[PDB]
Amino acid sequence: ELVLERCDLELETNGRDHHTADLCREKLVVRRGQPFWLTLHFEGRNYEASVDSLTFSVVTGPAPSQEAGTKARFPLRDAVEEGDWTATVVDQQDCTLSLQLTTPANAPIGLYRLSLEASTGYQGSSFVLGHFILLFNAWCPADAVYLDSEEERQEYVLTQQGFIYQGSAKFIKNIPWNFGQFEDGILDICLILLDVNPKFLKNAGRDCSRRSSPVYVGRVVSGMVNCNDDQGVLLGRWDNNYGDGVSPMSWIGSVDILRRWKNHGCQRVKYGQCWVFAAVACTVLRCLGIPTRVVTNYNSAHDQNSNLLIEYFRNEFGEIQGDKSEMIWNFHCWVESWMTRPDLQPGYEGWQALDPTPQEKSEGTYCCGPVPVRAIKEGDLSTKYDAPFVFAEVNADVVDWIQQDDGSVHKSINRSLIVGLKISTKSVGRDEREDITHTYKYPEGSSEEREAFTRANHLNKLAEKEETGMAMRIRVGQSMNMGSDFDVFAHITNNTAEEYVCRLLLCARTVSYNGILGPECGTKYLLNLNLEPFSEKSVPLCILYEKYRDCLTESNLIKVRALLVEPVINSYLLAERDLYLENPEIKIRILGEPKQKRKLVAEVSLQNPLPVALEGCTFTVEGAGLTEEQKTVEIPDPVEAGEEVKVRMDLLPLHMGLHKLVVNFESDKLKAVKGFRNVIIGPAL
């Protein structure tokens, strides 16, 4: 008799087993290289090896194939064997066959159609079992993305929230972000994002096959975000006016962006900048399975076309003149993902810097990486995918020329600057900052530092100076707040017996995170500054809200610049510092017992730090696990200079475990204020 079956279970169980439970919505989602349960139910009589012959087949792309490893067919048996696409009976009772499928550790990832045919006697029965998505497996020792520790698996693949470090090298700020990779519809969107990539358009079956490599998927996924022109998720913008969309600084996670992309026929979402590029990249990759973590670099030598020596030409005040010069990025962000690397000499497993921010290049404009981080540390520039570029980012040198008024350019000493400070990514499993500078560089003038600089043909720095034994730095005394007046100080130190009479040029300008300077918001110029011997001198500079408010950026960044001139020996000291102005905290109360499918309430508030009223006030809120939906509340009336603004959001968290709730506040005079609360959700009954 021809055997025929009632239904399939593809199961809930595997989700727990595969670390894809939240992801297992209407669909089955598993990670490659790992057995998964599948139970076949049958009408009347069960499967009998003494007659029934079940062979299984799976298919991925639009052009499946045996050679492209994007199709496979295999028989049911008792044990294992080879080829790695296997099916194996685990148990029978009544009319239900309980069995286990395994896919290889290098099967490509994507949507698969699982079909079953008999061959029971002579008469062939044949039909569609169901569908499942197969992903990378940080758990599968044989998979290329394997991590030894559960901790790091959890952090870099499973955790839907974290931190983007922003602010300033001397005051590191951690913006919270909802990566929400397992949020509904997001996996489906990440597939659409690869089924729409330039190479899938060229060949389709080639691309579908190449998605077994995390280097491919990484390079594709990253590139799709903003660069590559044509189709793409985000449109960049930088000039500081974002009225026709949402400003880059206004996003609290990468979910809405993705849905605004898909929900408007895959069109570039209005307005990202580098950290937004990364956070989205991080989401896509995590979703697919490549452990990825967003990284930030302070004083970043971006858009320098690999140049390891940047030079600047500056007037009698210290002001840069080259409108054909590129400024140093206060910070610039990218991501790192984890994979073995079979396409270069061995020993380069690990983190690879993928930078999805398009950079002007030795020919045109595009993305960067993957490149092993270790290579960048080692000086091994020849290592593939943009190693000279990531290297410049972290290792570029800077020469500051002041210009003497007969055509001559006199060299200045500038200690306040070193490219690639404070490289930051969230710790594993905690909210603390990990500092990863050491994975990129060796300490200055160490044995190993110069070993690496040789392999990069850098050298040419430093073991050098002009020595006048005067130093200068910029000091802030204490922290200062957006909306305040406050002072910063030029700090000169004279450690000799000479008494100099000096010129000192102090300048504060509003700036943006990538480096664009605005108008000055305070200046003090001194022409007979008396520095007495073996002494120190602090020169005050008043910076007024009334003076930075018009042009201040949502990054709340002000650059202080100072030039000390010794006229007798013609000596030039330069000191620069980027300040960050604090926003008010967002006070967040969590009301009720945090419980699964139980109403929760979030009380959210801040107090107005400006001396003028806030209008158009709005809070926004989201968090994977806490709401299925972004939530917003517009507060109708102005909030005056004194007072507070408070409102409640209703939440209905559908998942247990820890979740960051992330909140944005917006207003006419005060934008992109951020907040977060860690909420642990327990069980209902």
Ligand X SMILES: Nc1nc2c(ncn2[C@@H]2O[C@H](COP(=O)(O)OP(=O)(O)OP(=O)(O)O)[C@@H](O)[C@H]2O)c(=O)[nH]1
Footprint of ligand X (CB under 6 A): 168, 170-171, 473, 475-480, 579-580, 582
Q: CB 482 → ligand X: shortest distance, Å?
A: 9
Q: Which two tokens stand for residue 211?
A: 């998605």
From 84, 207, 355, 380, the catalytic residue: 355
Q: Which two tokens stand for residue 646?
A: 């408070």
Give, in order, the Cα–Cα distances in Å from 244 to each of 46, 61, 235, 270.
63, 38, 12, 8
The reply to whether 8 sits in an annotated binding site is no
**Could you tell me which of 643, 579, 647, 583 has the C-alpha nearest to residue 611?**
643
Residue recorded with tokens 């100080």: 489
Q: Is 302 considered catalytic here?
A: no
Q: CB 167 → ligand X: shortest distance, Å?
A: 7
The reply to whether 32 sits in an annotated binding site is no
The reply to whether 22 sits in an annotated binding site is no
CA terminus-to-terminus distance, the chain: 48
Angle of helix 274-288 versus helix 214-224 axis, rounded to 10: 140
Q: Which is nearer to ligand X, 199 or 549 (CB)?
A: 549
Residue recorded with tokens 């296997």: 86
From 227, 274, 502, 617, the catalytic residue: 274
Q: Which is nearer to ligand X, 185 or 611 (CB)?
A: 611
Q: Is 343 considered catalytic here?
A: no
Q: CB 671 → ligand X: shortest distance, Å?
A: 17
Q: CB 479 → ligand X: shortest distance, Å?
A: 3
* Maximum Cα interatomic distance, the chain, rounded to a whole number of Å: 108
The reply to whether 480 sits in an annotated binding site is yes
Q: Which is nearer to ligand X, 175 or 339 (CB)?
A: 175
Spatial contact of 116 and 56, defined as CB atoms under 8 Å apart: yes
CA dihedral 212, 216, 218, 220 (to 10 degrees): -120
For residues 224 and 131, what is the distance between their CA atoms, to the nearest angstrom? 26
Q: Which is nearer to ligand X, 170 or 595 (CB)?
A: 170
Length of the chain: 685
Q: Which is nearer to ligand X, 165 or 619 (CB)?
A: 165
For residue 396, report the phi and psi dihedrals to the nearest 5 degrees. Answer: -55, 150
Q: Is 190 considered catalytic here?
A: no
The reply to whether 475 sits in an annotated binding site is yes
CA dihedral 82, 84, 90, 94 (to 10 degrees): -110
Q: Which is nearer to ligand X, 582 or 615 (CB)?
A: 582
The reply to whether 444 sits in an annotated binding site is yes
Q: Which two tokens stand for residue 437?
A: 């500078």
Q: CB 593 → ligand X: shortest distance, Å?
A: 37
Q: CB 514 → ligand X: shortest distance, Å?
A: 17
Q: CB 550 → ligand X: shortest distance, Å?
A: 20
According to DSSP, the β-strands at 587-591 and 536-543 are unpaired
Residues linked to residue 110 through DSSP beta bridges, in sequence order: 134
The reply to whether 477 sits in an annotated binding site is yes
From 18, 19, 302, 332, the catalytic residue: 332
Angle of helix 255-262 versus helix 274-288 axis, rounded to 10: 80
The reply to whether 341 sits in an annotated binding site is no
- Residue 616 makes CB contacts below 8 A (sequence gap 6+) with 634, 666, 667, 668
Q: Which is nearer to ligand X, 161 or 168 (CB)?
A: 168
- Among all residues, which ones are annotated catalytic? 274, 332, 355
Annotated binding site for Ca(2+): 395, 397, 434, 444, 449, 536
Residue ranges of the annotated binding site for GTP are 473-480, 577-580
Residues making up the annotated binding site are 395, 397, 434, 444, 449, 473-480, 536, 577-580
